Amino acid sequence: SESFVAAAVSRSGPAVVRIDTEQGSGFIIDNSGIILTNAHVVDGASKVVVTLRDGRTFDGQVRGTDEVTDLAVVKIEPQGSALPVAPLGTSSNLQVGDWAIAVGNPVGLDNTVTLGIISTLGVEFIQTDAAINPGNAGGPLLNARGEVIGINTAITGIGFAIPIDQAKAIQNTLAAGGTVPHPYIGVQMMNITVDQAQQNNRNPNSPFIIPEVDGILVMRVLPGTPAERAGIRRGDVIVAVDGTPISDGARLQRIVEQAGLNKALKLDLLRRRLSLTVQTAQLR
Template identity: 45%
Template sequence: MRVCLAIIYCLGIALVKPAPAFAEHGFVAQAVARTAPAVVRIDTEREVRNRGFEPGLEDPLLRELFGDLPSSHRENGQGSGVLISADGLVLTNNHVVDGADRVQVTLADGRQLDGAVVGTDPVTDLAVVRLPDGTKGLKPAALGDSNDLAPGDWAIALGNPYGLDSTVTLGIVSSLHRNISSLGFTDKRLELIQTDAAINPGNSGGPLLNEAGEVIGLNTLVRAGPGAGLGFAIPINLARGVAQSLATGTPVVHPYLGLQLVPLTASKARDHNSDPNALLQLPERDGALVQQVLPQSPAAKAGLHRGDLVISAGQKPVHAPADLLAVVEGSKVGEALDLEVLRGEESLKLPIRPAPLPEAAAQG
């Protein structure tokens, strides 16, 4: 019996097929090899007006003291992007190409091409750049499903931080649905993927990958200072839809109510109500508290007041402003959206019709 087992064992070893070379590398290297050909560097140039020479703000004292100073200077910028189609569409951040007079795209194989910005959406910080017609040999990235993510999943960031091309960093998905307003950005509407994979200046617009090498997000910002090590990416499911609209020249419409909101919890409400100087009593439950109603907005027309607590929208519970914003973002302009509101001890149902988001108004 021992002899037979030895023969079988030896035969098993002899019949093993040699592993391909790439199998010697880990899953990160394999994921990078799959997507790296789609990652590009984006170099930009823009004209910037010097202080004191902005249109309508020219300072005659500067002319008198310093003579004919140049009214502007050229400013260079750099970021990353990812090819999402074989016909030359590159997805990147709006802040990478915003105001650029020239956009140069360097492909993974070293080719440098002039790109044209075909559409931008500042509210989601997304932009689409098109490469020249007829560009051959383009290898678009495979796009994943950001709805399948869970905290603890692998996250691989690709890009060109600090001009260091083809940089790879590894981490995990630290959190999901991180509202960008909690990071101090009130002019954006985004729920971000948080990761501890290192993201640095120049990574913006590059892809965040899962362990299979599929794009699950677009790197967009990093928390500097005491919060160092926190990076954030735009979920690819959102970016995919916005990119499709931008590529076809269709304006990206964001529904808007005209509310400024703050989160309210039952404990916060109790603390507020126990103050003898409180001007009004708040409902002691979670919700989105109306801090301000913008004049002439859909919210004003629907009759919302400061101090109202929104607890549901479109039959979905609202525990925080992010919940309401998610419902509003998924609603249709002009179609009635039912809000359930607590005003003191009174419960109200208020139908509201979202309008297109005006410029520089991304809340509510």
């Protein structure tokens, strides 16, 4: 009778809510009034209005946002009949080609639904060709069974969603109104190849000579950052973190994250050879 899409919607779309600050979608994940959405939906208003698909409206309190992840948590007070809940899936089970259903509640009285698949898997955003629109953003992304596997964002036609397993790791902290830790050092960085460095040094108009190595080229030192304060300059080649050699910027990020906030890291750089200690700080 019903397609599998209409069925998944029937499972999880009741709990998809409209969110208005004076706008987008979110979804209730616990009978106690915990609601997930995007930071772009709510921030920086601390007061929102939630509307259930059934037309019940609630005074929503923004519990906190994490701009780095584009996630926020809103709480409402469960009065009267029980709040419908969307069941959460696991995004680590996704495969490219899995069905993907994007549900909004932009009006408050019905769901908006679009269908597509998982297009890419890496925030490590899920990519999908399920059309993602305003108002549909901040709503859930379901798998074929109707479980939440992600949170739509309005970021072609390809759309991005925050994997659910990332929200599930951040949810406690955001509900408590705390700051999610995001350590960084503040450089735009690029993996540099020796063929790329010799190629660079052949060009009379490259901005700077590069020491013909496999490394992490500092492309830019962001203002106000630990990297600027440590004295790092554009054109520096990062050759290793403390001891371990590196040629991959993505690996450097993971070393900085595993360090934590307010940790000193020692960097091996070429400018000459130069070691500098950077104090990780919170990305803002």
